[PDB]
Structures are given as structure tokens and as C-alpha cells.
Amino acid sequence: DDFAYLNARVRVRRGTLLKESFFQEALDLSFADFLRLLSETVYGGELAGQGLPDVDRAVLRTQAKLVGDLPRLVTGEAREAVRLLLLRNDLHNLQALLRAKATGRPFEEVLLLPGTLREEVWRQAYEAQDPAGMAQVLAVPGHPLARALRAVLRETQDLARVEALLAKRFFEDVAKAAKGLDQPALRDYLALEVDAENLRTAFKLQGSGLAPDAFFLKGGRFVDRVRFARLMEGDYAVLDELSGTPFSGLSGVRDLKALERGLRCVLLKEAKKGVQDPLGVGLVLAYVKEREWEAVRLRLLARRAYFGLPRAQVEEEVVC
């Protein structure tokens, strides 16, 4: 309910993160110094042994203990405004369970990283004669999936076109739920994120030539239908046309890797602006997206430290 109560805890946790000199000095070592440097910080509270599954289980467990708490601890408008940040995990778990039900491989097949829902709902939500019953037992009240899966459930029971329209319905529903209340720093963020999402969808669907307007959504502002079509077909002056927007140094980029690098950098830049609002929802946004940037950069530095990769392979991926 109260934004300041959650914001105090989030500012305490933002007081404890990893600096730049950490990975700048962890850019050249041999994975034992990595275990050494992670023995001290707050990610070492769950580090059991040594090796790659230990480090991955430690990062996932500390992120679930340190990030998955803030969807709780408030009740009402505050949780309705803070739950729409860390909700990609629930979509990934739900589509994994959807393809597992549509495949036939057993229910203990997937690993099911934690999102925002307790896993007893997942254990109960595999056996249902009607997939509407699965969406009903999945339904916590104001949830976006609880009103999106039953929205695009109105064709069949279990298909893959259902999953594609589930993804599109999820994106437009999260954007509409951002528009449906008053947070002046989260509506613009989710609009810019879903603009990034369908832009990189158009980049990773180049060359095919299939109907783009069935894939293009609404909720972004920097792109429209004609830029989406002329970006799916191969001329990239339209990608050079985007100036004035925060897509600033991103011009003339063709391959998927440099594209997604630039999009992740501009998302973390525009999401670090959230200290502009030290009372509302901007600060917990600037905590959570900085935390996931730090987590995935820690993971990539772990991979380099273990496998002895050159630092020239990683130097471009700590640029922001």
C-alpha cells in the first residue's frame, strides 16, 4: 500500500551491490580467485561448495531471496505497481508448463525457476480437464496472466498458436496495465521495453518475409507499422532514422549480437533514471533491473573465469 515502506527496504538493499572495480579486477583471473571474491559478498550466503552448478544455484537462490521478496511486503496499489517488473519468470514457467502439457514429457521434467507465484499452484495446475480450470487455479486476483490466458483461451484447449497469442497478449496487457494506473516512471519504461521487444523481434525475424502485422503489437511509441515492415525488409536507414530517442549510439547495426547489446544497454540506462522518483516506483525499478544486469554480468564473468576465455571476448559485454 505504502510506497515509502517498500522504498526504504529497496534503498537499503541498493546500498549493498557490487561496484565496478570488482569485475574490472575480476576481468583477468582463473575461477579460484572468482570463488575467492564471491566468498565475501552477499551472494556467498548460499554458496554451498565449488563449481558451476554451485555458483548458478547460489545466484538463483540469492536472487530469489533478495528480489522475490518485494512483490510481497505491500498490499494493494503498491504491489499492483511493483509486480509488473519481475514477471518475465512467470511467463517462462507458464510456457514451459504449456509445452510440457502439449508434449507429454513428465511434469517433473522442467526445473521451474521461481517467479511471483508459490509452486503449489504449479503442482496443482497440471491436472485439469479444462485449461480454463488451469487458468482458474493459476488465478491470483489482479494478475496479468490470470486475465490474459483466459482472454486468449477463447479458441481451443492446448495449441501453439495459443502460445504465440499468449506472448502477444502478455506484452499488450502489461503495457495496458502500466497505462491503467498512475506511475509516471514505469509507463514510459514499459513502453520503451515493449518497443525494444518487437524491434528485436523484427531483427530476429529478418529474411523470412511472413506477415509482419500479425506479429507487430501496440503499446510502443518510437516505432509504428511502416517502420516495422521496412525494418523486416532489408534497409537499415530506418534504424538510422531513430535519433532523438534514447536509441542514441545504435545506428547501422545489422547482426543480432550487437543489436541486443545496444538494446540491453539502453534499457539499463533508461531504467537507471529511476532515482528521479525516490518515493514512487522508479527506485525499485532502478534496483531490480540493475540487480539483473549485475547478476547476468556475474554469470558471464563466471563462465569466462572457468573456461579461460580471452578478455577480448568479454570486453564488449561490460561496456554499460
Binding site: 558451476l52 573456461f307 579461460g308 576465455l309 580471452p310
Partner: protein, 104 residues
């Protein structure tokens, strides 16, 4: 198809729609190669280099006919910085294959 290369590498193989395993332990991987010859995974097997230098051992012990598991001495991602002597591997191919130790 099937590999026994590494416990980390086989995830991208399953991501390609292709069976893959991992042991990273030589005698245990030879046992896995025995049971994988016995449950023949579509007649093509790639075995890691610094796990078994020669993949031929299990097939030359058991199945001396028809060469059904096509055995490939595949590499790993630890030595993807240098490749570990592609042309030296070809020299040992020539010497193992015709008996004659020649170079060019």
C-alpha cells in the same frame, strides 16, 4: 545422433534437437559409450577428445561388424582457444591409416 562430450556442452545439442550426454570422466564415459552403442542413438556418436583419445575402443571390443556407431573424436570448448593441432590430427590420421609417417 548422440554425443558424450561434456555435461555443459550437451544442452546446446538438445537445443538443436539432438541427443547429447556428458560425464567428463574417462572410464565412466567408456561405460556410457558401451551402453550407448547398445542403445544405438541413430548410428552417429561424437566422443570428446580429452575424455577418450580414441573412440574406437568400445566398438572394436563389442561390434566388429558393419560400423554402425560412426565415431567422431570431437573436441570441447576448453580447447576452442587453440584448436589443438588440426593438422597434427591429420598427420596421426595418415600414420594410423596407411602406416606411413609422411609430411609435406
Amino acid at each position: 545422433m548422440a554425443v558424450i562430450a561434456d555435461p555443459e556442452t550437451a544442452q546446446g545439442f538438445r537445443l538443436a534437437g539432438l541427443e547429447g550426454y556428458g560425464a567428463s570422466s574417462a572410464e565412466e564415459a567408456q561405460s556410457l559409450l558401451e551402453t550407448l552403442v547398445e542403445r544405438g542413438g541413430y548410428a552417429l556418436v561424437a566422443v570428446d577428445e580429452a575424455l577418450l583419445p580414441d573412440p574406437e575402443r568400445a566398438v572394436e571390443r563389442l561390434m566388429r561388424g558393419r560400423d554402425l556407431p560412426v565415431l567422431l573424436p570431437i573436441a570441447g570448448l576448453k580447447e576452442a582457444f587453440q584448436g589443438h593441432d588440426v593438422e597434427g590430427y591429420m598427420r596421426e590420421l595418415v600414420r594410423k591409416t596407411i602406416g606411413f609417417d609422411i609430411k609435406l
